[PDB]
Design a protein around this ligand. Structure first.
Ligand SMILES: N#Cc1ccc(NC(=O)Nc2ncccc2OCc2ccccc2)c(O)c1
Ligand SMILES: O=C1CC[C@H](N2Cc3cc(NC(=O)c4ccccc4)ccc3C2=O)C(=O)N1
Ligand SMILES: [Zn+2]
Lengths: 382, 802
């Protein structure tokens, strides 16, 4: 990526940068019971590792947000398991951090931006007489686990548990000898137990993060190492948000309460053979994993809103096959500033898959790229 | 049923700390040894160690120090427990009575904080003004040692350096000074601070030294005639003082890391160093009031040592966690090494019991355990009578084959890569002296490769008869002895995985079937699988194997082939696999317990129940058809039940029991007549060489024993005044919980030790639920009978004191 700034997409300049911004963190204590409102027209798997821009039309939700600004501005997004019966078991709590009011055409329109924080289990759904839904919520705690060897550590070998700082672990050479030394010295006390060292390394957070980074660097060649957060929990949520997978897999990832299990599941999902297809014909391949690149700090997939309020998960790829351009490039709304768009449909589906972005300036390096919507994608396994 | 009874059969043998001082009296040299929850006191005489006292503590001993304040005629003992219970102990003798008196006690736990990576460090300054504890990163805790601090109040001072490796107190300074080594992005440095009790902060120290070796790990405080400190690293030994920097790089210490030290003479001219391989060094300091040079010489080889202590004249105690503890003599004569060591006494250490089996059930079963690691590896035969068979390599798993009268043991030995590319052994081990040997396939710097072997050991003589060497990079994980299908032959079955350093998840593995006939090992069948075989069990004439996250059942065909029958896919890794009839219990390392059943009509596996709760799990055992037992994080035991009084409740494994044991359990076995109102018998083996027994109880017995435990807690005086309920409370981070469903047999068996008047007050007003059917006032003799009948479910004990 040359002559393009990755900070433009993530700031959501299309919604407007004049939003009044609210600061001051609220966080319910672990395992307690809370009552939180739920927006009715938002059926998506909210991951704490992603944001949520929203534009609302109907009066009930605008009044709900208006008086919710006072009430800790926290609402719940339900992970709907079936859209018809609209039942769910888990969810995520997001606070409004950006918000503004319009009066265009004589109708109040509210634009807000939210970020997921906590996971919860829902007990019962109260349908208000006002038409909004308020749910009974129990906070699922964050499970932090000590080192596996802290329960058998020799008192004399505690002295040798501080290692010299890790060198470069990128490109190819990386620090492979350093990780061999790390395995030998950290899991030395595995000789007191029945399991070998590599088994304990398969359940070690740092090694799993290294493996995920190394795997990502092969497909996304321009990824520099500072992009991913250095905390296991934040890393696991960021990777979970960024992975283009189905609703069942995302709900499965959200059900996991420990960072280690989440990292292991993410590695399994990544290693499983994958290719992206439109769901109406699983025969018809659109994009491979080699063509996926991250145009923003949020990775290859993020959340955006069209002028009508619908939310699309957009995956940015270099070459998307089986697509039919309809119309001419236009810039009436700009998720990616400086890029026009044109609608795309599969050759025989005739269903909307995404948009073609055509560069307007004559010198930007990623001149032609494709944005596909996640709701129309299916990761076929050969 | 749900209610269980846990009793200690063999008390822990591993040594995790030892000090020398004047504890019993001013004229007596004493050796104090700490084992897990065990404290032993010895008077050092010319003929050896004379045992005097044995006291059990309500916790795991993390810090032991001897100090003498002003006005005291003899030393005091400071103990800090892993649950942060601290006490100061005194020794009192009144005639034939020996009592340990508690002078001060309290809990030093902080409500917020993260435990340090390098563990709990406890140091007492030479002049006995305070005690310094490093429990959490970034905080240093000081306890004043004035005579009115009965409850041990403490204050926290802020260390600006977060990653601290070692802390020590210096000698000769007018104000209390500490020295420590810390790590930052700039490297590793040495810094000194001054501790002020009056204003409670850190003042600047006498000196600061940036240039410290990158692998410096240990700090040695030098007594008054020299002063300063010595920093021990992987390469260099340095003496640090104001305007005094002496450094040496002896080639003899490059091969191994030094992990322990002890001061030989009171003037600090001599020190003893010990390394991870079992070598013993002496550090010599040359003087003119000032230091001139440092010299290092090698004395010889001992057991792999955890702690060293110099006793009397020329006698050194070697305390080992991996092997037998030793008493050695420092002769000037060099039999084979300069100032060689002569062994004079050895002490048993069952060490890290990895696997065990029970054999010869008739006349009384016998327990065979795989104990020790590296050159300390040995087989232990326990009947308490213990027999040791040295192997000189690490024993992993053991199984018994009654038809051939032999034991199959998986082992591994470390070998170095020679320049020619071949592997070479450092010492002759059991695998290299076998009468007959075979290799799976004929195949061909300074890197250590691990070679895995299968050994056949005779029942009567325990001589090694056959050794089998596996392929390159091959890891042996599981071993069973069983009959399959309609075949009358008995086979050894071994599950292996191919591990290469360039991939973390093993892509390949194989299952091998061996037959032992005519004194020769023959390979009958060989099967290749795409994964690692973590566990294998015998399931009603079929072989149940866990390959990665796949559970597979294998048939035995007439053509001596393994054939797949049914396949079940999980989202977890099946490390633990136990069966009872038609039920299969599957558990990964993250405590995610899964219960499956084999339905023979359809030939498929079905999921009955599950329970997912992230925690590190060490072992599981099936108690009965409804109860399952496991080892939790920290040192805890848990029991879960199924079908407790919708399909939601049926698919939930409800927890029933927690209990804090203090031991890390590796293996569970079913042995009942091994010793000849309890049901079942399960024996477990711990890292500290502890063997324990679990038996199931009923309603009335569990209620009566719990009531008796509550009454006994009010009468038994604990050392350090630690509460038994707090000690047995289930303890991990994020929560602590009271113990439920477990009866501690040790407190019940202590009932036979107390005096008659105290027994009467324990029993008084207890309404005895006699089995005859009428409830009546309990007499002391009835409870004596019940407790004796309870002690008749486990072995006798040897005598400690002399
Ligand atoms: N900060 C940050 C950050 C976080 C995450 C990412 N990438 C990712 O998660 N997947 C990713 N990327 C590029 C190429 C291929 C990729 O998967 C291929 C795949 C496709 C379908 C199913 C499963 C895997 C990032 O590029 C940046
Ligand atoms: O980069 C992007 C992705 C594209 C996206 N859209 C979608 C869109 C539909 C429309 N209605 C229409 O054409 C339309 C056409 C015929 C009948 C009725 C309506 C107007 C503006 C936008 C618009 O801007 C956006 O918001 N920015
Ligand atoms: Zn299509």
């Amino acid at each position: 990526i040359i002559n393009f700034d990755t900070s433009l997409p993530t700031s959501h300049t299309y919604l407007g940068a004049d939003m009044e911004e609210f600061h001051g963190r609220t966080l319910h204590d672990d395992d307690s019971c809370q009552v939180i409102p739920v927006l009715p027209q938002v059926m998506m798997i909210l991951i704490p590792g992603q944001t949520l821009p929203l534009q609302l039309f109907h009066p009930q939700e605008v009044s709900m947000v208006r008086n919710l600004i006072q009430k800790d501005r926290t609402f719940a997004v339900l992970a709907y398991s079936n859209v018809q019966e609209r039942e769910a078991q888990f969810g995520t709590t997001a606070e409004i951090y950006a918000y503004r009011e319009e009066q265009d055409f004589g109708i109040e329109i509210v634009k807000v931006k939210a970020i997921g924080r906590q996971r919860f289990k829902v007990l019962e759904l109260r349908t208000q007489s006002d038409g909004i839904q308020q749910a009974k919520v129990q906070i699922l705690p964050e499970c932090v686990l000590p080192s596996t060897m802290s329960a058998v550590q020799l008192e004399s070998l505690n002295k040798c548990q501080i290692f010299p700082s890790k060198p470069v672990s990128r490109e190819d050479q990386c620090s492979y000898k350093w990780w061999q030394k790390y395995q030998k010295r950290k899991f030395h006390c595995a000789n007191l137990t029945s399991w070998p060292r590599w088994l304990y390394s398969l359940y070690d957070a740092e090694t799993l993060m290294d493996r995920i980074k190394k795997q990502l660097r092969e497909w996304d060649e321009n990824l520099k190492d500072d992009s991913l957060p250095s905390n296991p929990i934040d890393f696991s949520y960021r990777v979970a948000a960024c992975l283009p997978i189905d609703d069942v897999l995302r709900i499965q990832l959200l059900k996991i309460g420990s960072a280690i299990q989440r990292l292991r599941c993410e590695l399994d999902i990544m290693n499983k053979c994958t290719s992206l297809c439109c769901k109406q014909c699983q025969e018809t391949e659109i994009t491979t994993k080699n063509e996926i690149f991250s145009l923003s700090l949020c990775g290859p997939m993020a959340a955006y809103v069209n002028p009508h309020g619908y939310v699309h998960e957009t995956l940015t790829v270099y070459k998307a096959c089986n697509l039919n351009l309809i119309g001419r490039p236009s810039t009436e709304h700009s998720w990616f500033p400086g890029y026009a768009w044109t609608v795309a449909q599969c050759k025989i589906c005739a269903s909307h898959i995404g948009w073609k972005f055509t560069a307007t300036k004559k010198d930007m390096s990623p001149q032609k790229f494709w944005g596909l919507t996640r709701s129309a994608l299916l990761p076929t396994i050969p | 049923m749900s209610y269980n009874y846990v009793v200690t059969a063999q008390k822990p043998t591993a040594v995790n700390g030892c000090v020398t001082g004047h504890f019993t009296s001013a004229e007596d040299l004493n050796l104090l040894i700490a084992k897990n929850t065990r404290l032993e006191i010895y008077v050092v005489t010319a003929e050896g160690l004379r045992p005097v006292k044995e006291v059990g503590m309500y916790g795991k001993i993390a810090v032991m120090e001897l100090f003498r304040p002003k006005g005291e005629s003899k030393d005091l003992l400071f103990i800090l427990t892993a649950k942060y219970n601290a006490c100061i102990l005194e020794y009192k003798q009144s005639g034939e009575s020996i009592d340990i008196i508690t002078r001060a006690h309290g809990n030093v736990q902080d409500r917020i904080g993260r435990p340090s990576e390098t563990g709990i460090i406890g140091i007492i300054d030479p002049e006995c003004r305070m005690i310094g504890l490093r429990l959490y990163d970034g905080l240093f805790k000081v306890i004043p040692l004035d005579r009115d601090n009965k409850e041990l109040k403490a204050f926290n001072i802020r260390l600006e350096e977060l990653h601290v490796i070692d802390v020590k107190f210096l000698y000769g300074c007018q104000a209390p000074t500490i020295c420590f080594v810390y790590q930052d992005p700039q490297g590793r440095h040495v810094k000194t601070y001054e501790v002020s009790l009056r204003e409670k902060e850190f003042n600047k120290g006498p000196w600061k030294q940036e240039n410290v070796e990158a692998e410096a790990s240990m700090v040695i405080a030098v007594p008054e005639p020299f002063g300063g400190a010595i920093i021990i690293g992987q390469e260099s030994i340095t003496y640090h003082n104001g305007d005094k920097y002496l450094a040496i790089a002896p080639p003899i210490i490059k091969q191994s890391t030094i992990v322990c030290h002890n001061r030989v003479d009171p003037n600090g001219s001599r020190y003893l160093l010990g390394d991870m391989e079992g070598r013993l060094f002496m550090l010599l300091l040359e003087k003119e009031v000032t230091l001139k040079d440092l010299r290092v010489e090698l004395l010889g080889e001992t057991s792999i040592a955890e702690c060293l202590t110099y006793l009397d004249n020329g006698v050194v105690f070697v305390g080992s966690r991996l092997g037998d503890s030793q008493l050695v003599k420092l002769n000037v004569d060099s039999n084979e090494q300069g100032s060689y060591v002569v062994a004079m006494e050895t002490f048993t250490n069952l060490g890290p019991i990895v696997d065990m089996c029970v054999v010869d059930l008739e006349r009384q079963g016998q327990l065979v355990t795989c104990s020790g690691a590296f050159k300390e590896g040995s087989l232990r035969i326990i009947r308490l009578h213990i027999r040791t068979v040295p192997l000189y390599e690490s024993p992993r798993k053991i199984c018994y084959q009654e038809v051939s009268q032999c034991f199959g043991v998986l082992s591994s030995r470390i070998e170095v890569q020679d320049t020619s590319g071949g592997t070479t052994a450092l010492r002759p081990s059991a695998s290299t002296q076998a009468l007959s040997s075979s290799v799976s396939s004929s195949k061909l710097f300074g890197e250590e490769v691990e070679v895995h072997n299968l050994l056949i050991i005779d029942q009567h003589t325990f001589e090694v008869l056959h050794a089998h060497q596996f392929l390159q990079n091959e890891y042996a994980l599981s071993l069973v002895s069983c009959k399959l299908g309609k075949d009358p032959n008995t086979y050894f079955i071994v599950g292996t995985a191919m591990v290469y350093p360039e991939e973390a998840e093993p892509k390949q593995g194989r299952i091998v079937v061996f037959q032992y006939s005519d004194g020769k090992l023959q390979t009958v069948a060989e099967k290749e699988v795409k994964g690692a075989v973590y566990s294998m069990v015998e399931f009603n004439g079929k072989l149940l194997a866990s390959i990665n996250s796949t559970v597979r059942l294998y048939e035995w065909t007439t053509e001596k082939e393994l054939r797949t029958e049914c396949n079940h896919y999980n989202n977890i890794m099946a490390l633990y696999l136990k069966t009872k009839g038609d039920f299969i219990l599957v558990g990964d390392l993250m405590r995610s317990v899964l219960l499956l059943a084999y339905k023979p009509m359809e030939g498929n596996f079905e999921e009955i129940a599950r329970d997912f709760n992230p925690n590190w799990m060490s072992a599981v055992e099936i108690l009965d058809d409804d109860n399952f037992l496991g080892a939790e994080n920290a040192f805890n035991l848990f029991v879960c039940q199924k079908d407790s009084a919708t399909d939601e409740e049926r698919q939930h494994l409800q927890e029933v029991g927690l209990f804090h044991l203090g031991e890390f359990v590796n293996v569970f076995c079913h042995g009942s007549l091994v010793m000849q109102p309890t049901q079942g018998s399960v024996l477990f083996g711990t890292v500290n060489g502890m063997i324990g027994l679990v038996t199931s109880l009923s309603e009335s017995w569990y209620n009566l024993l719990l009531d008796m435990q509550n009454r006994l807690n009010k009468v038994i005086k604990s050392v350090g005044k630690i509460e038994h309920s707090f000690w047995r409370s289930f303890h991990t981070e994020r929560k602590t919980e009271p113990a439920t469903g477990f009866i501690d047999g040790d407190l019940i068996e202590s009932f036979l030790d107390i005096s008659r008047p105290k027994m009467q007050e324990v029993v008084a007003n207890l309404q005895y639920d006699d089995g005859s059917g009428m409830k009546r006032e309990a007499t002391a003799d009835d409870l004596i009978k019940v407790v004796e009948e309870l002690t008749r479910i486990h072995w006798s004990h040897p005598q400690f004191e002399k």
